[PDB]
């Protein structure tokens with residue numbers, strides 16, 4: 001069994017993980033990370049299988065490094081993400097309906113128009129702007145919390161909260177050790193927003209509570225289902241949108257493709273999720289000795305799954321380093337796979353579609369105009385700044 005002291009959460013890896021991915025995949029199906037006493041999987045075949053194999057590889061002992069058999073979680077674990085069947089079943093079914101294609105039909109017009117308003121306002125203002133601040137971050141922060149049905153006061157808390165959540169999956173470091181003085185402030189505010197009386201419209205929050213009335217989940221599950229939406233909903237989409245915008249800005253070939261064929265706007269996002277894999281890593285815990293990739297993972301030990309590495313595995317993907325709108329990216333693992341596969345994927349897709357729709361209409365050319373700054377995070381490839389300059393037709 002290959003053994004290595006490679007550190008996936010060293011700052012150099014986090015800055016640029018591609019060498020690490022290649023080393024990982026090359027070495028074998030399974031690499032023992034001596035530093036963390038976890039078993040790493042980087043190839044598409046094993047990552048895909050580990051993800052779907054909930055029976056052998058559970059989520060309730062944590063999907064971060066921390067082992068909940070022994071270690072105190074930083075917050076009450078997600079009753080979706082950090083739950084196994086049968087406990088997972090009813091909260092999952094509630095969100096899978098509420099966030100599913102048919103349910104979002106009612107929001108498509110509105111999100112597309114909102115994006116048009118945002119893009120037209122921005123371009124009226126300037127042809128030189130930050131793609132992160134002015135687009136990737138602006139847009140989800142309009143439409144998503146609205147659709148959930150939370151108030152406008154405090155929305156600035158969503159990103160630091162999500163950032164903390166993603167950091168928490170990794171080891172203790174000045175990334176993860178981000179607050180304490182403010183973490184409790186953030187947790188106090190998110191939880192408050194989950195209460196039935198905090199929520200408005202017949203938005204997603206109210207629909208969770210209605211499902212509870214029908215007995216699909218309990219009233220004590222309801223706020224925690226809402227909470228899932230407020231932890232996973234905003235930070236993933238901002239950073240995913242920052243990534244697709246970065247990819248276009250540095251791939252003028254693929255921008256020209258989108259312009260030519262408007263329909264690639266609906267599926268550009270998924271190639272960007274494969275290519276970038278915003279969510280890089282998740283852990284599982286072995287429920288028993290499992291023989292995967294020639295290796296036996298001892299019962300009780302953790303696997304670390306490298307979604308990025310799998311999404312760039314040449315065993316599965318032709319020229320995987322290429323950002324290619326002509327790829328069929330179906331079967332990518334950027335949203336995971338199996339029973340825990342991103343229940344929010346349709347929302348993220350619609351957000352991307354709306355924003356790309358509106359931008360491709362108005363923007364001939366797009367270039368990097370300044371240094372880009374990544375925000376380092378243990379789990380989520382995240383973005384501080386992507387300065388761009390556009391040319392209008």
Ligand code: HEM
Pocket residue numbers: 051059063080081082092095144228229232233234236237240273277278279282333334335336337339340341342343344345347348
């Ligand atoms: C509004 C947007 C989103 C929402 C509301 C959302 C919500 C969720 C939720 C609640 C889960 C847990 C489901 C379960 O355990 O059954 C999940 C899983 C996941 N999401 Fe998302 N998500 C969103 C966008 C994204 C994006 C853009 C990505 C990646 C770029 C992403 C990556 C994932 C991954 C990798 C998992 C799998 C967790 C696992 O296998 O343990 N999500 N999402």
Ligand SMILES: COc1ccc(C(=O)O)cc1OC
Pocket residue numbers: 078079080081162165166227228229231232279
């Ligand atoms: C994909 O990542 C997540 C999924 C669900 C949750 C959740 O709070 O349900 C949180 C996540 O990251 C912080």
